[PDB]
């Protein structure tokens, strides 16, 4: 019989839940009611970037705080110079249904993917100076939701077939495959050491993986809807999740428990993208109500809103040096807020 | 500022290429194909392919009718769940929905999928072209008897053929009665929400009717005309 295994599973689970509860004695709200509040912070659209024909579905910041890449469902991948709003590259895509974009941490490669189930890697630097498709990765039985360049030769992707995988560009293999999710893995983020990454799926849960090891380390619950996006605290010990239930949450790795939840009654639309600031004090979250809100990472107060978009905000990313934040929305516009 | 001048020239070249691509992108209409496994949408896409990868995931069928260049996307190897990726097709000319009228057992399931597609938040303004495919099998089933569609839907006998019906010559009253019953079953959900933002265009495609492209062209022409009239506040 296997019913005994089924009941002991939840038994060995509830024991985990009560151990987590025992390890929890105080909330962040009580501890944080000492510091001076951040207060109202106003951000203005320093630069707007136009040229995309259709909605913008993803973006990434280059590792130089200057170059920007953005993918839109018109089939065009555009690389901007955020300082001068000059279109450096206008790479056209094979399939127009692109759902994710990435920038290599070297400035030489640019990745993309989407409903075509293929992660395409473009070589920015070439002998003739023309952008070419360096490699195409296949093996995902579902739409590609997110991809992050772990290295110049290694890339980790998360697709809608409840799996995440680690790929090698020079062979297009699947040396490591991360399974365990029970829904479409919507987003993932790498820790700032290229050692562990987290991935939020549609099963209202997040998991911590290990690129070197290959299996999930811990998993986090607490959400009641699909996790639309995920981020990572700069220290590497915490990460913030945004879900369709209009509530953001903070989790800690070593604590292995839910820390505190960001929410408000006025807002009702779900999250689309989250991103921490350089100091880890500001948490910027996108929304379907056409504006993104920045909340203090500790006291959970609406410091301000970046209300400047005419349609749903889909992508949002804080620069590597923290000098600026850029949001791309479905109105085919990118804005640089400071 | 020579490097700045070179960068500006490169940006100008890229912008001109972007305008050239924008003209073509705005000059074509994008359609999304939806339906169950036993809906015949594969046969429809195959016939309109000639009328004009392993994993795949998405497909394409560029057919041209009177120089309009419709793009027709059929979803391939994707998981059963479709709540998330359907947001990509929130700005398309129309959504083509194909239903197997003969299959009574899964008819209700097709009804719920059509209802969910109609009531989706991100497809509120997207019109739907309805293709009640496999009409010949539906025709032969009722004459052959031993079907009893009334058990699945306890409303057939309390129903009469609408006066709007225009049956083809030399066809039985029972077959057109059943056809219009199914069409009105879909139209009941069609005319229950959306006000005047998106509509449903039902058609009776038999198996291989070559006029499917013409029907799609006419429906898209109606949709664009309605949109333009709405922009001018006339409609």
């Amino acid at each position: 019989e296997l019913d005994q295994l089924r009941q002991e599973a939840e038994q060995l689970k509830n024991q985990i839940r009560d151990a987590r509860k025992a390890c929890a004695d105080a909330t962040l709200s009580q501890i944080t009611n000492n510091i001076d509040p951040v207060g109202r912070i106003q951000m203005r659209t320093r630069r707007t970037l136009r040229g995309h024909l259709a909605k913008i579905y993803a973006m990434h910041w280059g590792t130089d705080s200057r170059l920007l890449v953005s993918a839109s469902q018109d089939g065009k991948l555009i690389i901007w110079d955020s300082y001068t709003t000059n279109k450096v590259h206008a790479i056209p895509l094979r399939s127009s249904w692109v759902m994710t974009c990435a920038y290599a941490p070297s400035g030489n490669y640019v990745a993309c993917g989407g409903l075509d189930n293929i992660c395409s890697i473009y070589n920015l630097k070439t002998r003739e100076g023309n952008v070419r498709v360096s490699r195409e990765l296949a093996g995902h039985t579902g739409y590609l939701s997110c991809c992050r360049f772990l290295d110049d030769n290694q890339i980790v992707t998360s697709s809608g077939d409840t799996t995440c995988a680690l790929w090698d560009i020079e062979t297009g293999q699947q040396t490591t495959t991360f399974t365990g999710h029970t829904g479409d893995v919507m987003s993932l983020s790498l820790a700032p050491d290229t050692r562990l990454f987290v991935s939020g799926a549609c099963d209202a849960s997040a998991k911590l993986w290990d690129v070197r090891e290959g299996m999930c380390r811990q998993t986090f619950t607490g959400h009641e809807s699909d996790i639309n996006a995920i981020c990572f605290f700069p220290n590497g010990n915490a990460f913030a999740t945004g879900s369709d239930d209009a509530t953001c949450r903070l989790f800690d790795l070593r604590a292995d428990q839910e820390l505190m939840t960001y929410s408000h009654d006025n807002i009702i639309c779900g999250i689309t993208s989250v991103s921490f600031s350089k100091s880890g004090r500001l948490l910027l979250a996108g929304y379907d109500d056409f504006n993104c809100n920045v909340w203090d990472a500790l006291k959970a107060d609406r410091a301000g809103v970046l209300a400047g978009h005419d349609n749903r905000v889909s992508c949002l990313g804080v620069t590597d040096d923290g000098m600026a934040v850029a949001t791309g929305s479905w109105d085919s516009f990118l804005k640089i807020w400071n | 500022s020579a490097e700045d001048k070179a960068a500006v020239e490169r940006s100008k070249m890229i912008e001109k290429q972007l305008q050239k691509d924008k003209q073509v992108y705005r000059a074509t209409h994008r359609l999304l194909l939806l339906g169950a496994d036993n809906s015949g949408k594969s046969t429809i896409v195959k016939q309109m392919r000639i009328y004009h990868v392993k994993t795949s995931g998405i497909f394409e069928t560029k057919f041209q009718v009177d120089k309009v260049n419709f793009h027709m996307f059929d979803v391939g190897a994707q998981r059963d769940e479709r709540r998330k990726w359907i947001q990509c097709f929130n700005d398309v000319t129309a959504i083509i929905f194909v239903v197997d009228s003969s299959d009574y057992n899964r008819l209700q399931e097709a009804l719920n999928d059509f209802k969910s597609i109609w009531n989706n938040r991100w497809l509120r303004t997207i019109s739907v072209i309805l293709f009640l495919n496999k009409q010949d099998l539906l025709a032969e089933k009722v004459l052959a008897g031993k079907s009893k569609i009334e058990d699945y839907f306890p409303e057939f006998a309390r129903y009469t053929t609408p006066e709007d019906a225009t049956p083809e010559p030399g066809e039985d009253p029972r077959v057109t009665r059943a056809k219009y019953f199914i069409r009105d079953e879909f139209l009941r959900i069609s005319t229950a929400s959306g006000d005047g933002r998106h509509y449903c265009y039902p058609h009776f495609t038999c198996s291989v009717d070559t006029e499917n492209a013409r029907r799609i062209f006419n429906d898209c022409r109606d949709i664009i005309q309605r949109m333009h009239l709405r922009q001018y506040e006339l409609l």
Partner: nanobody
Amino acid sequence: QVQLQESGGGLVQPGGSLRLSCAASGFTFSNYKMNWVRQAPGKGLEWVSDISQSGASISYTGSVKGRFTISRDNAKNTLYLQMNSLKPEDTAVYYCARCPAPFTRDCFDVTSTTYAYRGQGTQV
């Protein structure tokens, strides 16, 4: 955590009555749309009924139209399904699925083979 449990079911003579109680925890039960999905043996999952978040918009399948009734208890975060006049073809496993998006009418993928927000189910 999203947890759904079902109570009731069993084996009864044809034409009898059965009561199904669904217990939901881990989310605000008063801000969601709950659906009933049944799967007959040797057959795929079939949608049965849906209840709106306000308890007004209620629909059923034509197979059990006018015979199956539903009840929702937002205060207790529980759902009660009452059935009468059991038919020989009504034997199936019933799951009290939940629509994914809160504060909305539509909900996709309720009848999925591997839907995340679905309970284990009770055989009837």
